[PDB]
Amino acid sequence: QLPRLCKFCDVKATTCSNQDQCTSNCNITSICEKNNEVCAAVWRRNDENVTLETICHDPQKRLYGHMLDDSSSEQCVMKEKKDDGGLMFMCSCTGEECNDVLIFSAI
Structure with missing residues (x-):
């Protein structure tokens, strides 16, 4: 099948809410076949300014002091x-x- 592909967009004001399913709103396709790179998407929401970032980040280093828990998951x-x-x-x-x-998801 295809190698590794993930959205690579900077953190900008997003309109995505904490819904069971949300989109990054990104429109870029970064290739991550030159390594075990993975897709990392972090969505933040401050007061009335929600920013969403999408890029190929390894679920190894904690971003923004956060640790991804679903990199191995589909x-x-x-x-x-x-x-x-x-x-x-x-x-x-x-x-x-x-x-x-x-x-x-609350859960």
Whole structure:
């Protein structure tokens, strides 16, 4: 099948909400076949300014002080990390654009 592909967009004001399923709104396709790169998508929401970032980040280093928990999973889930002043969710997945889709579930 295809190698590794994920959305590579900078963090900008997004309109995605903490819904069971959300999109990154990104429109870029970064190739990650030059390594075991993975798709990492973190969606943050501060006061009335929600920013979403999408890029090929390894679920090894904690981004924004957050650790992805679904990189090995086929479905990327938005993890709620201690965010003061706003909420920041980060998720990863070796899937394709799987990151672009930020799943938000209370549970």
